[PDB]
Amino acid sequence: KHTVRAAGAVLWRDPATVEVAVIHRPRYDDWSLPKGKLDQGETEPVAAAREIHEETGHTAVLGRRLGRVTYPIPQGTKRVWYWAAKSTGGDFSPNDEVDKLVWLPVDAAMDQLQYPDDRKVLRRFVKRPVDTKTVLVVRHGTAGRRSRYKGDDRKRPLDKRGRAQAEALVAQLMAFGATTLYAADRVRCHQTIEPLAQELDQLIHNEPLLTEEAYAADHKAARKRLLEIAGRPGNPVICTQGKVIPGLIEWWCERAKVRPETTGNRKGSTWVLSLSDGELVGADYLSPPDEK
Template identity: 60%
Template structure:
């Protein structure tokens, strides 16, 4: 759980920094119990600092920010939450230490659970959106709140995954369609499970390539769902019929739930560029590495935000 009080006047957002403390949190929201067309946002009170803020906390060793965000929400609020779009990162100095703390924030919808006071949080409020800013203790949290309010909160999510590492196409002597994951690729596939579940993954489909299917098989097993095969979303299928493949991707996105699509490096960048151009979204820079994920936020059948996760594996950091 979080244990550092931020300095209220010296923070930065979305800038390259060399932080040495890493944390994750969320703007936790729900539909208002009294009006389903309005939302409420959760704020927590920490008696140690007598402040009101969003739930957040430090990453455990070997943990990613995404997994940490969901865990911290549960530990501090008792709520199981489903992440949506990434909002921003905030960096600030820790008073009394020569350290910088970096906190990544997501939008997160409350799914189940209820608050009970605990060692770090003695009170939680659900507030209408227009009353949240005045209750927050820190200006940087108000910056995060403004990012949250820029788009509708009630978006649906599509998770577009590039297959994990599967060795070299040139060095593989068999049928390339059957080329399997290598050892690191299998580790990546296993690591994708909690990452994608944090966003509420519910259904799984894959291009008809062994390496694609193997990438999402651990997730499908965890969810007890089949891997649906989508030939149009292979490199060959996409090249032969890009319009059909794009239409198929959009139909999958409209199926409901949180759809996971696993495809290849020759498909994903072009598909995302077309989708973003069509719906007027600016894509963030991305290298589209093996086992990377695009988190696509949809509203009213249109793409409204796209976030990129470079790797499901935790970042190895030097000891402080």
């Protein structure tokens, strides 16, 4: 019943014309997909990107999430979440952890992978486009509690936990190749992506149409604005509030007939929206960085 958390990837290069990486490990004599256990304080996407680079030598950009594999181990239950990950280069060198890496088209990869669950991941990988662009919709971090004033406090800041959530979100959002930054017109939303702003040296665009008060006054304008942002070149991060996100996500998924595998709305959480030719093809809910 104790869960060991891990993450990994279908790492690919070049539609089933791509090649995917399959690794061999001499400790187990197995062929499998690269993956590994989360370190203290990592989230799954951070661990996936790190373990990809450690086991294959390649850097990569994560995209669509491809489901979860569990299996019993002496410690309890091993849990692996998998992402599609596009190689951004690197070179493999054999060692004692991983002694071989082969790049295979999907069909021959399916023959090489010994675990049925890995084959299931790879089937998911091919079901939808993999060369995707990415929108990251983030609910701001923890910011104490609303006062008894009607509606909303413009300037309430992140609390200490929330500031730490903001710092922890840099690595997670960098894992998906975030490039451009947007925040609803509340201090707490800006402060959530300010650490990422500093890392990228990028300015945070301000978004009055995406606050809770605006969504409630004019939801059509909020939806239009999301699409406008998503249509721009780059991979945008959009930080907004709890009353806004569920409605926007549900609307987009409905219209494009995308089924989210997980759902939630926690402060510090992230929705990874994968697009192919402007069409939504994945909506993946990630837990806040300090929650399970």
